[PDB]
Design a protein around this ligand. Structure first.
Ligand SMILES: C=CC1=C(C)[C@@H](Cc2[nH]c(/C=C3N=C(/C=C4\NC(=O)[C@H](C)[C@H]4CC)C(C)=C\3CCC(=O)O)c(CCC(=O)O)c2C)NC1=O
Ligand SMILES: C=CC1=C(C)[C@@H](Cc2[nH]c(/C=C3N=C(/C=C4\NC(=O)[C@H](C)[C@H]4CC)C(C)=C\3CCC(=O)O)c(CCC(=O)O)c2C)NC1=O
Ligand SMILES: C=CC1=C(C)[C@@H](Cc2[nH]c(/C=C3N=C(/C=C4\NC(=O)[C@H](C)[C@H]4CC)C(C)=C\3CCC(=O)O)c(CCC(=O)O)c2C)NC1=O
Ligand SMILES: CCC1=C(C)/C(=C/C2=NC(=C\c3[nH]c(/C=C4\NC(=O)[C@H](C)[C@H]4CC)c(C)c3CCC(=O)O)/C(CCC(=O)O)=C2C)NC1=O
Ligand SMILES: CCC1=C(C)/C(=C/C2=NC(=C\c3[nH]c(/C=C4\NC(=O)[C@H](C)[C@H]4CC)c(C)c3CCC(=O)O)/C(CCC(=O)O)=C2C)NC1=O
Ligand SMILES: CCC1=C(C)/C(=C/C2=NC(=C\c3[nH]c(/C=C4\NC(=O)[C@H](C)[C@H]4CC)c(C)c3CCC(=O)O)/C(CCC(=O)O)=C2C)NC1=O
Ligand SMILES: CCC1=C(C)/C(=C/C2=NC(=C\c3[nH]c(/C=C4\NC(=O)[C@H](C)[C@H]4CC)c(C)c3CCC(=O)O)/C(CCC(=O)O)=C2C)NC1=O
Ligand SMILES: CCC1=C(C)/C(=C/C2=NC(=C\c3[nH]c(/C=C4\NC(=O)[C@H](C)[C@H]4CC)c(C)c3CCC(=O)O)/C(CCC(=O)O)=C2C)NC1=O
Ligand SMILES: CCC1=C(C)/C(=C/C2=NC(=C\c3[nH]c(/C=C4\NC(=O)[C@H](C)[C@H]4CC)c(C)c3CCC(=O)O)/C(CCC(=O)O)=C2C)NC1=O
Ligand SMILES: CCC1=C(C)/C(=C/C2=NC(=C\c3[nH]c(/C=C4\NC(=O)[C@H](C)[C@H]4CC)c(C)c3CCC(=O)O)/C(CCC(=O)O)=C2C)NC1=O
Lengths: 172, 49, 160, 227, 97, 61, 161, 172, 161, 160, 172
């Protein structure tokens, strides 16, 4: 597991030189944005169980055959497993937002998630539909200017949007 | 000739007689001038492909 | 197109084009402004016309997608929608060509040999194009829906 | 009276040592009952036992074991008797034992219980006759009395996947819940008539002429974004 | 020719450039190269190569069968370089050029 | 079953060694059979009975 | 158009001699395999459509000759393939019965590679289709019968190359 | 594990359809043959160790190269394993005879069994004839009428036959 | 002008992919027969004049193409034959080493049948000379090597037909 | 390959192949087992050999990737690595062909005309192949690294 | 787990007979010089520590790039893991010398070691010459006639040299 600072340390550890004085200015620009980072995470971790169930409900109206009798997410054993499966993806996306780099997203979550949907028979294209349902709810809640000073945060919600459509192309 | 007669052209004058027909009446004038010849009827009249 | 087979018609007959042929090449090119608008509607609606096209196709033919159906799994279902994207594309060609000549020699000539040789139910793919037709004609006015639907049902006729 | 089939070992990460004194970040969190937990910290052990022996799915209300949970909290049974109650639990039979054979169920009960991968495929052959002769209750106590279970878990540790990652690296191996799911490809494909008949919904329509061919620079844009 | 394959001929050019080589020897030094053999003798019919090679070296195509027989019979015995030498060392090359 | 002890066990290994000329008794693979379709040629016939009869003349010299 | 018996009679007749021991020696060799060839030609007639469906799906089904621009894109062009592959599996069946590949170059090979170059048909993908079709044919008729039917497939692939 | 009743239910819940009235009667057909279904199994387990040792001796009246030195079933660990596997296969087909379908037979025993023996080196078809030496030792043992009165029950012993040759082709 | 390795590299390169298991699978098959082809090309180089002398004497030596009026009468015309047959036995040796008949149609077959019709050279007697030359070549190099060298002779005979 | 140009050499000279030519076709085909193993190593190491190849290339030539460099931005850098994937592929062909004949007529003949006409510094792409060579020879033993590196430096020579 | 005394007993009852006496004196060929065997292994076991430390330092004079930054053995965990592998391979050739055969060498050490070195990015060439650096230095340390009685035993120093390269053909 790395954070954003660890990928600059461990890169030049393989090159073996000291960290340059123009690279410290890139790390100090990150800690100036370090407190706008912490309320993108606090906005999405607090409405976490309503990002999930409002995105599942939007999925099951577009593709109604996933919940009809003989469908994949039909029973009450497997509706709960489908609802869990978006909670785990939203968990590791917010983990990779607070670290700054995606090295824990594709390690404990995406490392072979595609190959276990071929074994389970789960439609992997429909999990990537319901991740982009959750991307549209989470970047709208990271623009919420209540209890926070007004400023430009467009470069950090575009990084949160990057970890959502990385986990969508890794299941199809 | 390969299709409606089962053989190649024979001479040069057999070309110019049948080219001028196709030259003036197109496909519908040429194929009717082969199917209505005597050489068709001697080999195939009305029943043999 | 109407221009190329109105020529090859009069070509075979050893003659030029009649007023009946030249007052329609004339009538077709003045129609050309309205044709590009119609094809322009279907061009960037392929996301909704194909995906909703395969919507009703599976609800009406669950056998083809059920286990044992030809389009079963994540793989075949993607190709299951790929063919609909093909036939939706050829209808855009037929609308601009003013004829099913583009649809004729692409996707229609010998189509039963392909789908019979692929194991695909040819009646099933005919059901798919009909589902796309209701989505397509729902995107256009009545004057246009008599055309865009008009090319689909020709494809329905030749596909069975 | 018929000893086991003498299989062979292989090369793995758990049978060497790490030289990791003061291990930094990827430690897999030894929950234990010798650290004397509080009643809110017994609850963080019981969730780790449910996540290890089941997956993260089957921690439902019906799959909880509320009488086995109370005997752990009274210190009547150990952790080793608590893992044995979870494999012999009736949710573990009908969800993870009726839907695969005996040669895949040995791959579950060595990945989750012993925390290591299988050595080779003969070990699945060498272990699967224990389940068919004396049963699943005879299979777990001969798997919990091995030296690989006692020399790094013992009588007080909920098990874990030992040495999943290499300490200078960041990729490592696959987690075992994402390695072996509830059923495999060989149980799913044979039942496509009664069960598992779903047919797949429609993918997002990609047009065919936008796909890259050999000698296109759009096949290297994922390389350039990793620079 | 491209710069990749002209590097093998650079020993021939500046040998010509300091005035150490004639034009005929320059022409034969180019035609007997593997850069030429890999282009007009190898990928061609054995009689079309003799026809094409005859048209570059001498400024005309072959007259009849006896002329094309004679160069072609040389390719039986000596081969590719033997045909080029038999044209540049011909009587008609030395008379016109 | 004849001798129930498996007939053999090929009384042991004395001087049992590999330099055993495999198929030393005796031959194999006949070549005159193969089957070429053409003969090995010859001249004379038609066009040429004149000179054979006539090379008898000098044959004995 | 000669079978093994026709070719044996021709070579024995072309020298004006009778059928000696060597000519009948090959004829006896052909009659021994007469039982194998009919059963080989039996199952191939039954699974003609299944063999061609297996070959194209195994060799050139999803390659980009199948996609737009590839040599097999339009439905007329796709339908010409299975029509075209049917002759290779059919004429190879004739060579397997006749025991002589004379019928192939007489009726298939001549003007074939010169025709595909005219149409622009890829000879490379064609041979691999026949190679894959040869692979499935060895599945049905067995090993030695597949060796016989396979002996005429590569004869087509060799001359078509 | 499904019995004969659950296989009707699992096919009807997958389609989301109730049970019909003529479907109930075919399961009510099964319970009036309930004593005849049960007392077949009261034969084949009560003479069960006789069926093992009679068939295992009579296999080496047919193929005595297994007990040959160098053969597969030669040694006393391996002779104890050959009587083990024929005791297990006889045990699961008694479970399917009390069920009514073979779903416990091909989920426990026969699933993935050919690839065991080929990785073991055991001859595949040579254990299938040991199963067919147990069927005629049991279907003749089922037709015996000791203690029970007389009625036509050839339909049930065909299914008892029908498990032994479903199991025979799964090891070849 | 491609050998078996050149043809394998071309097909694997023309799709822009690396040499997968199937491409190397054929390459290993070619390297296995690499020892056989050199010894086959070894003896053919030694007995080049003897093979051509055997073929013409066995096929067309005494036929009436050899007599006056026949296509081979004058000494210039006879000498052109053994010159001409030398290329067929030579280029077939190249195809046997390269393992690919691309060199034949590149340098022999193209414009060949169109040339013999111009000169009036009998294509019928030409193929039988090559067939007889194929028969003697199987004598020297053996059976399987003759099968390899013979596989390119009839390729010439097929296209020259 | 060595087989095709040992033929076309003896082809031009109106002769057959000498023992010097036929004892090397013989020596090459017995070498063929070892060649496929070497090419098999580079085949599924292209992810590291290319990505680490462009690693040292940018550290040694930051101009080409800096703003104004030819491979600047997300776009050109992807194509910046695409060419290295090409040349790494041709080296796998040269190893199996036993010669740079595949590398000769692909990626070497007239290469200076292309890269000069694309605005790319040809010296820069030569630096890229050298960086791939150190990664490639680090993946093989000494007996193999004298070959796999041997084909790279030929490409280095012709690329300047 | 078998040794050279159990090597011929495996081939004995695979055929199925008693022990022929052409080998019983030839199993008394090395119980004479089994007293010569145990003081040969007392130089690779009781002087194991100088072998791994000397040869690794000489290896880096041959390859200077494997102690550079970017090299494979660069940090302190890797360099400790490198001698961990080199003291586990000449562990098991002292386990191979004590048993006569090489069945504990390939199984308990080398069974998959070529796969995991390709799965770690380690070059298989330089891990072969890590054992060739300790191949000639093990037999030349075995050839100290001082401290021991004297006599030529060149049979066993070809056997122990024949096990070091068995690892060196199993890792590349
Ligand atoms: C542990 C809890 C914890 C938090 C929740 C944050 C909360 C937080 N954010 C800011 C400070 C800020 N917070 C924002 C954030 C936003 N403005 C917007 O328009 C967006 C809606 C939103 C984030 C997406 C900005 C833009 C600033 C800096 C003000 C500026 O530079 O303009 C500050 C003041 C810091 C300072 O004065 O230096 C604090 C305490 N930090 C924490 O430690
Ligand atoms: C513990 C297990 C157990 C059983 C096996 C049955 C035993 C049993 N079987 C029958 C009754 C019967 N049992 C049989 C069965 C057979 N008769 C034959 O001739 C065949 C040998 C054999 C079937 C293969 C038949 C056919 C009847 C009905 C008698 C009749 O047909 O009139 C009855 C009388 C009441 C009833 O019908 O149930 C009882 C108690 N009950 C049990 O509790
Ligand atoms: C209990 C543990 C135990 C040991 C460690 C050894 C130690 C040992 N070795 C030898 C004795 C010997 N040891 C060796 C062996 C060698 N000498 C050399 O010069 C070579 C370098 C080296 C080969 C490996 C030789 C050659 C003899 C002399 C006997 C002989 O072979 O004639 C003797 C004297 C008695 C005898 O001959 O057996 C003893 C005690 N023996 C044991 O019983
Ligand atoms: C380590 C982190 C982690 C990952 C990445 C993970 C994936 C994962 N998803 C699973 C199941 C599942 N996933 C789904 C999800 C869906 N099916 C649908 O129809 C929808 C399209 C979609 C979501 C809405 C369902 C229904 C199952 C249950 C399988 C079953 O019981 O049949 C399972 C099997 C049981 C489970 O643990 O939930 C795994 C192992 N599990 C993990 O523990
Ligand atoms: C432009 C005219 C045109 C068409 C139509 C066309 C079709 C076409 N459909 C194919 C496959 C396929 N097509 C289907 C289709 C279906 N499955 C179903 O259940 C449905 C009924 C149906 C779609 C609505 C499936 C499942 C395959 C894959 C079959 C296999 O993998 O064996 C393939 C082979 C793979 C490929 O190259 O794409 C072609 C060429 N090609 C053309 O050039
Ligand atoms: C069954 C007995 C057994 C075997 C056979 C075994 C092999 C083994 N060698 C390993 C690593 C290794 N092996 C080496 C060795 C080398 N790399 C070099 O560059 C040098 C050329 C060479 C030694 C001089 C290194 C450096 C690592 C660690 C890789 C790393 O952590 O970066 C690892 C990875 C885990 C670890 O860090 O220890 C295993 C499992 N382990 C075992 O327990
Ligand atoms: C009995 C001996 C014999 C053969 C073999 C034969 C071939 C033949 N193949 C043809 C076309 C064709 N052949 C193909 C075949 C292919 N496309 C591919 O990508 C594949 C590599 C290949 C299938 C294996 C296609 C696509 C056409 C149509 C070409 C066009 O419309 O331009 C045509 C043009 C006319 C027509 O099909 O009606 C002929 C005459 N004729 C014969 O008499
Ligand atoms: C799911 C129910 C189930 C089945 C069916 C099963 C079969 C099974 N049979 C086995 C061995 C065996 N099976 C046999 C049986 C035979 N070999 C012969 O030559 C005869 C044909 C036949 C006896 C009549 C033998 C001899 C072995 C021992 C192989 C060995 O130990 O090397 C083994 C290897 C472990 C062992 O017993 O040593 C398994 C896993 N295991 C199960 O859990
Ligand atoms: C390398 C590929 C290749 C071939 C094959 C080739 C053939 C070729 N054969 C020729 C003539 C000839 N070829 C023959 C051959 C024959 N007469 C017979 O009866 C037989 C059937 C046959 C011998 C097998 C004869 C007699 C001539 C002389 C014709 C004449 O003087 O009119 C000529 C005219 C010029 C000359 O020989 O100098 C060419 C170019 N050229 C090539 O580049
Ligand atoms: C198999 C032999 C072979 C090669 C080598 C090849 C190269 C090649 N390089 C290209 C572009 C390019 N190549 C580069 C390359 C570089 N920029 C740098 O700074 C570096 C010095 C260098 C790479 C290491 C760039 C930036 C472009 C895009 C130029 C542009 O967009 O104007 C293009 C045009 C786009 C395309 O079709 O890919 C071709 C054809 N084609 C071939 O067939």
């Amino acid at each position: 597991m790395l954070d954003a600072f660890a990928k600059v340390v461990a890169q030049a550890d393989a090159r073996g030189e000291f960290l340059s004085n123009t690279q410290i200015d890139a790390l100090s620009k990150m800690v100036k944005e370090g407190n706008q980072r912490l309320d993108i995470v606090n906005k999405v971790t607090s409405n976490a169980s309503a990002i999930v169930t409002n995105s599942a409900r939007a999925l099951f109206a577009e593709q109604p055959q996933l919940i009809q009798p003989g469908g994949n997410a039909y029973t009450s054993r497997r509706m709960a497993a489908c609802l869990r499966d978006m909670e785990i993806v939203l968990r590791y996306v917010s983990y990779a937002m607070i670290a700054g780099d995606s090295s824990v997203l594709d390690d404990r979550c995406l490392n072979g998630l595609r190959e276990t949907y071929q074994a389970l028979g789960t439609p992997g294209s429909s999990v990537a539909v319901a991740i982009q349902k959750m991307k549209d709810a989470s970047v709208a809640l990271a623009n919420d200017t209540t209890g926070t000073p007004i400023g430009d945060c467009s470069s950090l919600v575009a990084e949160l949007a990057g970890y959502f459509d990385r986990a969508a192309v890794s299941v199809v | 000739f390969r299709h409606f007669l089962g053989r190649n052209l024979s001479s040069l004058a057999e070309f110019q007689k049948f080219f001028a027909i196709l030259s003036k009446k197109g496909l519908t004038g040429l194929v009717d001038s082969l199917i209505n010849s005597r050489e068709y009827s001697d080999y195939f009249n009305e029943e043999t492909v | 197109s109407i221009v190329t087979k109105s020529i090859v018609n009069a070509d075979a007959e050893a003659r030029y084009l009649s007023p009946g042929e030249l007052d329609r090449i004339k009538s077709f090119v003045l129609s050309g402004q309205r044709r590009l608008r119609i094809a322009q509607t279907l061009t960037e609606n392929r996301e909704r016309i194909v995906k909703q096209g395969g919507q009703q196709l599976f609800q009406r033919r669950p056998d083809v997608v059920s286990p044992g159906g030809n389009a079963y799994g994540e793989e075949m279902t993607a190709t299951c929608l790929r063919d609909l994207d093909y036939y939706l594309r050829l209808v855009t060609y037929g609308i601009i060509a003013g004829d099913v000549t583009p649809i004729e020699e692409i996707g229609l000539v010998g189509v039963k040999e392909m789908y019979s040789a692929l194991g695909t139910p040819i009646s099933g793919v005919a059901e798919g194009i009909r589902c796309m037709k209701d989505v397509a004609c729902s995107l256009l006015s009545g004057e246009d829906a008599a055309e865009v639907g008009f090319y689909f049902d020709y494809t329905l006729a030749a596909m069975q | 009276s018929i000893p086991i089939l003498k299989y062979s070992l292989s090369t793995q990460n758990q049978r060497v040592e790490s030289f990791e004194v003061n291990p930094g970040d990827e430690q897999y969190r030894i929950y234990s009952t010798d650290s004397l937990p509080s009643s809110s910290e017994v609850d963080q052990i019981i969730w780790a036992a449910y996540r290890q022996i089941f997956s993260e799915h089957q921690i439902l209300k019906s799959t909880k074991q509320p009488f086995l949970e109370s005997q752990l909290r009274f210190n009547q049974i150990s952790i080793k008797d608590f893992i044995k109650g979870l494999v012999l639990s009736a949710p573990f039979r009908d969800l993870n034992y009726n839907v695969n054979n005996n040669y895949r169920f040995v791959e579950i009960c060595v990945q989750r219980v012993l925390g290591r991968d299988i050595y080779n495929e003969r070990e699945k052959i060498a272990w699967s006759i224990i389940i068919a002769t004396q049963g699943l209750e005879g299979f777990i106590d001969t798997l919990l009395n091995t030296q690989e279970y006692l020399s790094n878990f013992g009588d007080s540790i909920v098990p874990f996947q030992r040495r999943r990652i290499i300490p200078q690296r960041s990729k490592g191996e696959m987690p075992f819940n994402l390695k072996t799911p509830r059923y495999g490809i060989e149980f799913r494909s044979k039942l496509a008539a009664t069960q598992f008949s779903w047919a797949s919904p429609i993918r997002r329509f990609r047009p065919q002429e936008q796909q890259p061919k050999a000698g296109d620079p759009a096949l290297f844009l994922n390389m350039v974004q990793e620079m | 020719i491209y710069q990749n394959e002209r590097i093998g001929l650079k020993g021939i050019d500046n040998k010509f450039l300091d005035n150490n080589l004639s034009v005929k020897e320059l022409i034969r030094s180019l035609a007997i190269s593997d850069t030429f053999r890999s282009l007009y003798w190898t990928p061609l019919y054995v009689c079309k190569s003799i026809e094409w090679i005859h048209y570059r070296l001498l400024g005309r195509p072959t007259y009849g069968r006896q002329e094309i027989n004679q160069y072609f019979n040389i390719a039986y015995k000596k081969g590719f370089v033997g045909v080029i030498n038999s044209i540049i060392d011909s009587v008609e090359y030395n008379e016109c050029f | 079953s004849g001798g129930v002890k498996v007939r053999a066990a090929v009384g042991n290994k004395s001087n049992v060694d590999a330099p055993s000329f495999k198929g030393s008794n005796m031959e194999l693979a006949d070549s005159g059979a193969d089957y070429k379709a053409f003969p090995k040629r010859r001249m004379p016939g038609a066009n040429m009975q004149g000179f054979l009869d006539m090379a008898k003349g000098m044959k004995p010299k | 158009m000669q079978d093994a018996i026709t070719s044996v009679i021709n070579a024995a007749d072309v020298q004006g001699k009778y059928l000696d021991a060597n000519s009948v020696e090959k004829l006896r060799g052909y009659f021994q395999t007469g039982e194998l060839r009919v059963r080989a030609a039996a199952t191939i007639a039954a699974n003609a459509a299944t063999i061609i469906k297996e070959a194209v799906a195994k060799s050139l089904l999803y390659s980009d000759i199948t996609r737009p621009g590839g040599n097999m894109y339009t439905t007329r062009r796709y339908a010409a393939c299975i029509r075209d592959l049917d002759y290779y599996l059919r004429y190879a069946t004739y060579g397997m019965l006749a025991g002589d590949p004379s019928i192939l170059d007489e009726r298939v090979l001549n003007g074939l590679k010169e025709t595909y170059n005219s149409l622009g048909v890829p000879i490379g993908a064609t041979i691999q289709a026949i190679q894959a079709m040869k692979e499935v044919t060895g599945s049905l008729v067995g090993s030695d019968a597949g060796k016989e039917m396979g002996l005429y497939f590569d004869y087509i692939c060799s001359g078509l190359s």
